[PDB]
Amino acid sequence: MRFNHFSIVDKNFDEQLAELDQLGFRWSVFWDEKKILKDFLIQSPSDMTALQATAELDVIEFLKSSIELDWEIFWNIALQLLDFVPNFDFEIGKAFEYAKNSNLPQIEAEMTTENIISAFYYLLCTRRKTGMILVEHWVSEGLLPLDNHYHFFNDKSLATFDSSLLEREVLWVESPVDSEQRGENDLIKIQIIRPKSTEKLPVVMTASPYHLGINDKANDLALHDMNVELEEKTSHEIHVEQKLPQKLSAKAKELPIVDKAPYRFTHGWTYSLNDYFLTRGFASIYVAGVGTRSSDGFQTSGDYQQIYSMTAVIDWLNGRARAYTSRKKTHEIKASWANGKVAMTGKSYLGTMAYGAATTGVEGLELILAEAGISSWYNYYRENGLVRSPGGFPGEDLDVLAALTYSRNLDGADFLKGNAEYEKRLAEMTAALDRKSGDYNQFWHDRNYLINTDKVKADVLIVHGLQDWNVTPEQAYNFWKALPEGHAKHAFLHRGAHIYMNSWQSIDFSETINAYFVAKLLDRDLNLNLPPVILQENSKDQVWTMMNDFGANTQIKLPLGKTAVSFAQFDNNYDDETFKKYSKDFNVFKKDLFENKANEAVIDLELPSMLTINGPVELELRLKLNDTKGFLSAQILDFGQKKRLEDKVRVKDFKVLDRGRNFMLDDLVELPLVESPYQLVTKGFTNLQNQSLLTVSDLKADEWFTIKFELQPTIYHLEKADKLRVILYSTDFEHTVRDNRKVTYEIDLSQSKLIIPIESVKN
Amino acid sequence: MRFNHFSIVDKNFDEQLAELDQLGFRWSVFWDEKKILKDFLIQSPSDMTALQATAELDVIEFLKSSIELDWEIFWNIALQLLDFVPNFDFEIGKAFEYAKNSNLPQIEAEMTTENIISAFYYLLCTRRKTGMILVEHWVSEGLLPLDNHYHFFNDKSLATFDSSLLEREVLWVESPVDSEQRGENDLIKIQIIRPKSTEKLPVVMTASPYHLGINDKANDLALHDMNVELEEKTSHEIHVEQKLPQKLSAKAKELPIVDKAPYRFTHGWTYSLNDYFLTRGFASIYVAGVGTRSSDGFQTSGDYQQIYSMTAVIDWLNGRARAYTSRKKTHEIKASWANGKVAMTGKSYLGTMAYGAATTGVEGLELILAEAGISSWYNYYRENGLVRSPGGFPGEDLDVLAALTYSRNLDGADFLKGNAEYEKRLAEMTAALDRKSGDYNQFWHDRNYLINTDKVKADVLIVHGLQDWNVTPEQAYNFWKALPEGHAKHAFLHRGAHIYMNSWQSIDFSETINAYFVAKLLDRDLNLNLPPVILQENSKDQVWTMMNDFGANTQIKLPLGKTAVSFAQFDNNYDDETFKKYSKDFNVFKKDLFENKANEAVIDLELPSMLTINGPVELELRLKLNDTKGFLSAQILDFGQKKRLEDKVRVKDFKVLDRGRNFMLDDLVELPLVESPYQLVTKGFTNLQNQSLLTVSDLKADEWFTIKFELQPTIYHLEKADKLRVILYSTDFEHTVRDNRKVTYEIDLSQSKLIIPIESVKN
Hints:
Two copies of one chain form a homodimer.
Chain A (H helix, E strand, L loop, with lengths): L12 H11 L9 H10 L16 H6 L6 H11 L13 H7 L11 H13 L8 H7 L11 E2 L2 E2 L9 E8 L12 E8 L6 E7 L8 H7 L13 E2 L19 E2 L13 H7 L4 E5 L16 H14 L5 E2 L7 E2 L4 E10 L1 H10 L6 E7 L5 H5 L16 H8 L6 H22 L8 H4 L13 E7 L8 H9 L6 E6 L14 H13 L11 E4 L7 E4 L7 E5 L7 E5 L4 H9 L1 H9 L6 E6 L4 E5 L2 E8 L5 E15 L4 E8 L8 E5 L2 E15 L7 E2 L8 E6 L3 E5 L4 E7 L14 E5 L4 E5 L6
Parallel strand pairs in A: 5-8, 5-11, 7-10, 11-12, 12-13, 13-14, 14-15
Antiparallel strand pairs in A: 1-2, 3-4, 3-9, 4-8, 6-26, 9-10, 15-16, 17-31, 18-30, 19-29, 20-28, 21-27, 21-30, 21-31, 22-25, 22-29, 23-24
Helix pairs in contact in A: 1-6, 4-5, 8-13, 13-14, 18-19
Enzyme class (chains A, B): hydrolase
Protein name (chains A, B): Xaa-Pro dipeptidyl-peptidase
Keywords (chains A, B): Aminopeptidase, Cytoplasm, Hydrolase, Protease, Serine protease
């Protein structure tokens, strides 16, 4: 196995001794090393009598013997404390080497009392085989009491807050939006989970429109039919201007103020990362926003009205907004328990709200941890003037999502009063989507946060899977690039798909975030020094590395032509039998597509030297077709039998992650390295009539022309022997419209090039 | 969706009113029905303002209106309380019908105050769509306080015990066994989890050798090679006698007695069913037994020494055995908090310990809930004088399991002191297994609990999957049949494989067990009337029914011959290329086998009339082969495209099952009904030299002979149009040894019959 640590903060010896002292390890520099070892074991929750010290002695016998401590014996014992099984996982007497091969943090210096003290200090910061760093594992076993006070170790907050004393309250924040123009402010319900504390508490907020329930039936009924014809566009230029929603201010009111919230709740969805923080002194707040269960308004899905319905919570936490005990607005409640500092978490739609909220510059929002989020809704349901369904979900669009998350209709009483207004507004949204052209427009522009990144003041932490074709990498890439120069930002890019990564064995993600959260939300110094991007290497088992940026400046060019006279063509139309079996199951189409058994142009490129792709690949193509309309599709896969990481996790151990003290037990998981015949590196699409998103032009039939479009950005490393399978085609029975007209594409490969941004590395 | 209830206990009106009163619903027979409805909603944790009463009014408006209550309005509201979404899951105004089609308990009588009161009473006993009965759902939301006192409703214990006050203690019970003959009693470590209570507490014990860890490496290394030759047997008769282990008594000792256990623990594996009971006033005790981590002895795996190491715990709970605070035996501890009543739970090895423990007749052991358990170890690793690996695990045997569960070696300090003795005893076990003949012997006889069922005094509840080929149905079937006449016994047979069934949406299993457990462990009357067997119907979605017995007396006979001159033959030997690809992956072999693409004899039988198989199928065959040794294999599958239940569960909802108050949240799951080309009904194997397990006979080559052997028992219903695919063959690359010698089998189909026990049903 292999470990990777990014959460270990370097500390001086005096600092180390002081922190150890706080944990009950009161040592001095002139103590004997075996005495320090003995005290370390005795003061801990571990069972000394079960530990083996050497090939011939257990720990007790070793302590009684005259044999002196060396690094091998130290590691024999340390690995056992880290949950490794001696004689089976590792060889007693070769523990030092085993630790080295596992990439565990190790002190490499002479055996002295001072060096031994540091080895123990950092051992406490080290991940166990079962997913938790030693110190937290021991804390969960009783090392420290549950006193509901902050206790820090290596700049991390420990789980010293009693989860049995958590308060679960409900209240409505008065937002400055009127999504349905009723002439009143929309009240937004929020759920609060906070530990007991004698001091103001930071907040970890998750804005989830899914939180209070989902409407699957309405979702399936709104689903769009992909089996339609591709409409031709007229030469024209698209014009847009940015206009932010006007904040509505509620009048003055002399209402009485209550101390505690009268309404409470017990069950609710939670993000395991938020739970981890609850016992570490961080309250959680979940908001569903406008158009959701128990709240007012329409499900404006993505625009700034929804963003403001969420950020109102932050205003309330900072005493800049009003909250009531109920929707009757008879009593007001204040955030007397909060310090006003906030951090947003969650993936997908939740990460999307974090990006959006960040672009408002709201004070108090200190940082966002946006995972698999959307920075511009247009790219989630479209691509270069084309209708492009999210990976795995054909027929989906913003109106289908609106129907899914308009949870107000989940309550019969609410359905009765607001269903009419809802359908009216959903129909208006559906027409605004313009699935006919698939072009960018004002409606989409109002859901593009990239144009407001200049207002971002919060630190930005981005998490994104490089095999996530649902919420494409461009989403993270674009926000990353639009952020002003010198802005505090970091990205974690893994190889999974649309999944979380806070329960993995290969990286100390939660512990790293812990350090970052305490510094930003508790007003402390951030001693943690993280690189620009933390990347999980492809074709490697549990290997993580660091990069300087996402998107390199250097680039090499590979011609698609193998000769000076190389032409390639393929049809758009399939036989009616094959066309209908591809439309019924896009997975069979993908299989054939990848194996060159469908209408396509395949180019197998032998790689010159090893290289690391870092950024969006560009496709410069010279083609022609016998029609005045059409689009092009392209997929690039790492072709050939080889071990590669799957995009779906596998379980390592069940319920070994304790988010407190027998609180929300979680499983330890990890992406498996398995042999595959190939793997998708990146893909992209473009409407041949869209030279750019804003300009549509006429297309001339039977005439040669050249197009330049980028594919999804990514970071992928290839060896000099690997092969890149470039697939060019039209209809994609998973993303684009399915038009079966008789058209023929012809590509001049010798005039076609593949531009690839590569990590210079300065190897 | 469809629900099935077996936990609802019938109660008189006076009883109903009294129980409702205890929940805070203080009603009288002369109250108006709308007033009762109003009080019911107001006194509950539900949100009245979100509920819809009619197609035009919400509940509040309905209460204010003059419209009277009828059964349709009642169900409109009841379905919402049961978590169904009005207007989407069901049609407002047609709620009564929807409830009927979902098989929900319904009162069918005139609308009166008395009938309305009963409808509410039983509504509280009814399962919600999300997996919990209404009353328990509301209790988890605060309907009743956490007072650590027993509260009963419809004969079920409610979750009124505070999980935050659970005590987790460790101690060692002095067993009466000396598995390694050291001249001392083996101390057995136990983990106790008990809620706070002012009265003696029943106990729910789980004997799990896996509990404290498993040794996967040792498991893989002990794995046996299946690619070996089949040895011929000599005519002889096997002789066995039953001899129980002599209980060793520890001498007297004047040790001081402590009040509370000094040793404690925090983390540990638990069975969700046991957790469910913790908050309902039932303590949990987990034991790993002899040869496990922190306990003395060898891993005797299955014999009565291991059984006694577990039952010693029950003796201690009843003041008949000594327990110490530590292995130093300096202080004694007594079970002052226990009432002495015990119930055993768990599946597989754990269910096996329950069967075994039951055959000892130990006082205090009131009942066992044995799931997928083994009643005789021989059948788990053998079948009719043949080595037959557990389904899915080729090469496994008792010694491989011993290596897996000898968890004492997981501690380095223990490895040092007892590894030598361990390997010595494991080698002795391996030789005793006699994989050469595969015959029954004394070693196996000492691990056969079926011969001691006359000593069973505890009620017996059996749970077993009819698609579990790991731990075959014969295990449950045999114990069921050996139980003395009139003995209290019940069986739940589902269609899953080696899985649990206490978190399903289609059956109220936990609630049924709740009622059974309180009556038996708390000395109360058992008013619950359960049928002999609760069976989940095949080829049906969420349908459960009841049967009078497992194994019918009636039987029909189907000839395998389609004509008077019908012969069939097949080889044993395959080409060396095919033989090695089948040995590397038995799944490809099974695929070919089922699709008649391997060396086999297939008989497609058209069924005359519909029928329900109930018991073991018998195969009377007349065959011959050119050899003096060999075995026969047979599999019978329900052939043909049709919707069938898979043997693996699918998730319905995440974390909706609360085992307390935000305690051990669990997912609601269910076996999915999907279309399949076929499905295995039953299979069996036999050594042609074994007329019976105890008599081995010589085999004559090129000579006709007839054999009669049974396949695995089961209950499967077939329609008159279904087809039974009977497959006869030799080598099974999943269960039996892989001998590729050149032999030819010939079967006389006209002299061969299929005897099938059928449920008379008296249709």
